[PDB]
Amino acid sequence: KIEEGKLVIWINGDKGYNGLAEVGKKFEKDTGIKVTVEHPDKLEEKFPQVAATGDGPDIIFWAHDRFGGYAQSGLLAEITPDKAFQDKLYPFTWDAVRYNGKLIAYPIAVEALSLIYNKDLLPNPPKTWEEIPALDKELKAKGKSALMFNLQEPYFTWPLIAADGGYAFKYENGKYDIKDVGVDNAGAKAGLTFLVDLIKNKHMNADTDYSIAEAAFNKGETAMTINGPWAWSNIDTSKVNYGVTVLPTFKGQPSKPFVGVLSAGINAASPNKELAKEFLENYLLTDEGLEAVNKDKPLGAVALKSYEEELAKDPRIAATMENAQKGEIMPNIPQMSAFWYAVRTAVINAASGRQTVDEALKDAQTNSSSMDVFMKGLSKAKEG
Amino acid sequence: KIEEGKLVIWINGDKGYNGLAEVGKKFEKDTGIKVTVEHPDKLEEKFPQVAATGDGPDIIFWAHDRFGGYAQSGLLAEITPDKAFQDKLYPFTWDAVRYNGKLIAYPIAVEALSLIYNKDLLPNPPKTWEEIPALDKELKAKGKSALMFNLQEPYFTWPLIAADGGYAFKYENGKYDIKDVGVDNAGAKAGLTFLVDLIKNKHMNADTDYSIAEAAFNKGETAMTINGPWAWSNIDTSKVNYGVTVLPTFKGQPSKPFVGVLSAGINAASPNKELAKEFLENYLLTDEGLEAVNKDKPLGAVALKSYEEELAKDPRIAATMENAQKGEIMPNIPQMSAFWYAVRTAVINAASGRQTVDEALKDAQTNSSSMDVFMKGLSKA
Ligand SMILES: OC[C@H]1O[C@H](O[C@H]2[C@H](O)[C@@H](O)[C@@H](O)O[C@@H]2CO)[C@H](O)[C@@H](O)[C@@H]1O
Ligand SMILES: OC[C@H]1O[C@H](O[C@H]2[C@H](O)[C@@H](O)[C@@H](O)O[C@@H]2CO)[C@H](O)[C@@H](O)[C@@H]1O
Incomplete structure (x- = not known):
């Protein structure tokens, strides 16, 4: 029951959903595709419930730790970034969204x-x-x-x-x-x-x-x-x-x-797998895109290489990096x-x-x- | 063409049929029912044939994948374990022996x-x-x-x-x-x-x-x-x-x-359904029974919750479990x-x-x- 022709995005209530919605606005202004951002409760428990029945959002945002379980239950589409785009994100961040030899999500930021x-x-x-x-x-x-x-x-x-x-x-x-x-x-x-x-x-x-x-x-x-x-x-x-x-x-x-990588996965049952990909790669994972989200709620050390200068003006990120180095990456x-x-x-x-x-x-x-x-x-x- | 009073059991020649035989010996010593274990070639093919004409074993052991087809041909009795017994096995293993809602065999081990x-x-x-x-x-x-x-x-x-x-x-x-x-x-x-x-x-x-x-x-x-x-x-x-x-x-x-669950099904044409049921719940599916079979030929990760003891120690079982997680359960x-x-x-x-x-x-x-x-x-x- 996932409507085709429009994007539906789940992201946690503590994150910058309003800024992300603003990214959704430009996407619509450009594609005429209506982008709807939602922040349900227990969304990391919801998603597998609904996705196991072929329903749910087109794009789900969460820290990378839970995407393995999702992928294991075949709930996530494999993402297909060309070599050019992969070279835009830090290799560590891709590694975080790699499960059983396949990329199972787009990485956004290190938390x-x-x-x-x-x-x-x-x-x-x-x-x-x-x-x-x-x-x-x-x-x-x-x-x-x-x-x-x-x-x-x-x-x-x-x-x-x-x-x-x-x-x-x-x-x-x-x-x-x-x-x-x-x-x-x-x-x-x-x-x-x-x-x-x-x-x-x-x-x-x-x-x-x-x-x-x-x-x-x-x-x-x-x-x-x-x-x-x-x-x-x-x-x-x-x-x-x-x-x-x-x-x-x-x-x-x-x-x-624990070090978490906020990541965006594509619903296996989504009819808009191609729209999701263009939104994430061409709209969200950009300087302007991440900025809009960061202005709402700071993301952390973002996956996008080009954002490094901008982050260098933020001593808070220095503290984030220092605590990350001392922690352990979540499996x-x-x-x-x-x-x-x-x-x-x-x-x-x-x-x-x-x-x-x-x-x-x-x-x-x-x-x-x-x-x-x-x-x-x-x-x-076998189910989820 | 299936004799009443004694139990004939079929199981593959690569499994612990001698171990199983011993379990039948402790059964024959407590009931007087002579238990015969046989390991026919092409057994998965021979059961549906003989059992269609009312012949064959009282109990067939095979990976769960075949049992769907056996059931549909009314070759298998529905098994009636009570909540008490069902609790003794992992729910995943009961799932594997479920066809059209009904339980159609006892799960034994994950392969x-x-x-x-x-x-x-x-x-x-x-x-x-x-x-x-x-x-x-x-x-x-x-x-x-x-x-x-x-x-x-x-x-x-x-x-x-x-x-x-x-x-x-x-x-x-x-x-x-x-x-x-x-x-x-x-x-x-x-x-x-x-x-x-x-x-x-x-x-x-x-x-x-x-x-x-x-x-x-x-x-x-x-x-x-x-x-x-x-x-x-x-x-x-x-x-x-x-x-x-x-x-x-x-x-x-x-x-x-593939992930298989070695299962034991009861012939629908068997006059010994109650003995077969007792043999399975009370003799085989215990620690002492699963050990006898296991000691002959390891079973893998057994369905019986209480056996978890021995299995935890064995890293071969761990490798097995590891491979099972990455694999897919047979339909x-x-x-x-x-x-x-x-x-x-x-x-x-x-x-x-x-x-x-x-x-x-x-x-x-x-x-x-x-x-x-x-x-x-x-x-x-
Ligand atoms: O408490 C368990 C919980 O921890 C992590 O959730 C974090 C999340 O990573 C952060 O982005 C932030 O939203 O706080 C959450 C904790 O409330 C794991 O990612 C999550 O799977 C886990 O359940
Ligand atoms: O090769 C097809 C065959 O695969 C499985 O048989 C396995 C069985 O599950 C194991 O317990 C062991 O006996 O090895 C067999 C392969 O020779 C299926 O269970 C079976 O139905 C199928 O014919």
């Missing part, structure tokens, strides 16, 4: 979490996670707090969990060993334990989510938050005097944020979808105390690599 | 081909199909070869044929579309052409079969073979130092072996049998040079397709 901080509340950001409790105690006396960030998504907690030796899937001999999962080793337990103690000692609250943390930071209630380039625009609007810097170290080790393998759900459940359970750290992380490793998982993987590859 | 290599001849197995010719050239100078596997059954060549885009029947929405066959596409042609060139340049021989490839690998004459878990037992006996690994890629994409539609004959013919013909690859797959495409549809199409005068 990584950074430490964002209020300079008026905190002229010098803390170098270590360890000093944060004491820092919060001081700010509490001023009716402020040290740190608020989204605790409902493992994406935001991962930098701390991976710091002392946490890892998702081991990478050996040019492949991800889908049975060597590092979410239950000593490093992970240490990172998550520090997070839980922060909550035990009332320096953070288990129920803090994206909206709550963002409001608190943008209204000057808390000295720090943890977020990506997309978040900067709302801070610009808040007039809070903020800096963007390297994440704090844990046990002397750098925080390790795009199909078992990623179950990894996330597993870690999500663990972080939330440890945080709320429903489970201990040892317990939560055991179940996390069990639910991300096991015979049960592989088996469901075999049926998921 | 997939892997690359098997001799570590002494070949410390690091090749990552791509493409480097095999050069490898074979090196090995030939030592009086050895790179690769031998069974070229008489399309099952063994399919992983290569599927790699770049070949497929049996298209699965879209929730069903297999019988009018969307993929044995004739560019990907199929590319893979079969590669296989044929291996043969043309003498890296392999068109007439190599299961026995020949097995003896060659198990005697240390060839560095690699392609085979399933059932084969490991003989390699163990051979004392060859071997590993089991992910199939090589072709054109940068993984080989896509079970009645048309599969015709599909198999057609592709068997095409591979054998392309391999021998009786037909070109293009010609061979064109015909395989046509003949894999449904005669009913062909005949209806002629109704368009």
Whole structure:
């Protein structure tokens, strides 16, 4: 039930959908093709539901990590950029959208979490996670707090969990060993334990989510938050005097944020595979195109080589690059979808105390690599 | 023509039929029902014949792909396991034995081909199909070869044929579309052409079969073979130092072996349906039963959740699982049998040079397709 002759695009609500719509406007002014941008909830869970029935958007935007599962279920069209166009993007970014030997999406920008901080509340950001409790105690006396960030998504907690030796899937001999999962080793337990103690000692609250943390930071209630380039625009609007810097170290080790590549995939069932290709290659992935989106919500280190000068005027991107170098590229393998759900459940359970750290992380490793998982993987590859 | 009171079971001669026999011995010791295990040649062909006339075994073991056709001909009783028992097996495996809504057999184990290599001849197995010719050239100078596997059954060549885009029947929405066959596409042609060139340049021989490839690998004459878990037992006996690994890629994409679920179906003409059911749920499909069979010839990744223990340790099973993920589950539609004959013919013909690859797959495409549809199409005068 995908209408032919018009483009429909899904992109997350935290990203610059309005700017992207503006790119859709010029496309229409040129082609007469109506471009419709939407930002549904749980769109990364929606898409495979609807695409497995031949429905959905023409173009889906998401970080590269989930496109492997999609491709595995044949939900994504293979993209066909000529050598000329490939030479316009950094090879690393193409690599991120390569699954089972095929390009499964157009890469847009490299994303990584950074430490964002209020300079008026905190002229010098803390170098270590360890000093944060004491820092919060001081700010509490001023009716402020040290740190608020989204605790409902493992994406935001991962930098701390991976710091002392946490890892998702081991990478050996040019492949991800889908049975060597590092979410239950000593490093992970240490990172998550520090997070839980922060909550035990009332320096953070288990129920803090994206909206709550963002409001608190943008209204000057808390000295720090943890977020990506997309978040900067709302801070610009808040007039809070903020800096963007390297994440704090844990046990002397750098925080390790997952590196994501925002990517645009083409629905396998789309009747407009050719229109999608011209929009993405000729309209979006251009200086003017990316700028329009970046002006709405900053993209990060974009895939387009030619944007480098423009990005060089932005110290925030420097901080993004520094945190990216210290992090690990997200795998795009199909078992990623179950990894996330597993870690999500663990972080939330440890945080709320429903489970201990040892317990939560055991179940996390069990639910991300096991015979049960592989088996469901075999049926998921057949349906989704 | 099927005697009541005792159980006759059919299972392929490459599986653990002696192991199975033992399970029947612990059955005969608890009920008094004499259990007979037989492993007839062309068994997948003989069951539908004999069982149509009310003869044949009480229980047939075969990969799930055949069972769709058996069911449609009313050769299989519907099995009635309760929620309690169904919970003991992985839901993926129950799916494989589901036809037109009804469960038509008990799933036993998940099968997939892997690359098997001799570590002494070949410390690091090749990552791509493409480097095999050069490898074979090196090995030939030592009086050895790179690769031998069974070229008489399309099952063994399919992983290569599927790699770049070949497929049996298209699965879209929730069903297999019988009018969307993929044995004739560019990907199929590319893979079969590669296989044929291996043969043309003498890296392999068109007439190599299961026995020949097995003896060659198990005697240390060839560095690699392609085979399933059932084969490991003989390699163990051979004392060859071997590993089991992910199939090589072709054109940068993984080989896509078919995934099979070894299943046990109950003859619809059997007077012993209740004994057969008990034998399967209470004897075979337990830890102690699956071990007996497994110890004879490994089964692969067994359907029984509780066995997960042993399987986790075995990296051969891991390789198997790895290959299974990259592969495609065999359809079970009645048309599969015709599909198999057609592709068997095409591979054998392309391999021998009786037909070109293009010609061979064109015909395989046509003949894999449904005669009913062909005949209806002629109704368009
Ligand atoms: O929390 C699990 C979640 O993490 C990542 O999602 C990020 C996304 O990459 C960012 O672009 C941004 O929108 O924040 C998201 C977290 O809320 C993974 O990409 C995603 O698949 C995963 O579920
Ligand atoms: O070659 C066609 C053949 O492929 C499959 O047979 C496999 C079977 O699944 C394995 O368990 C093992 O016995 O090797 C066989 C190949 O010789 C299909 O299951 C079968 O129906 C088909 O004839």
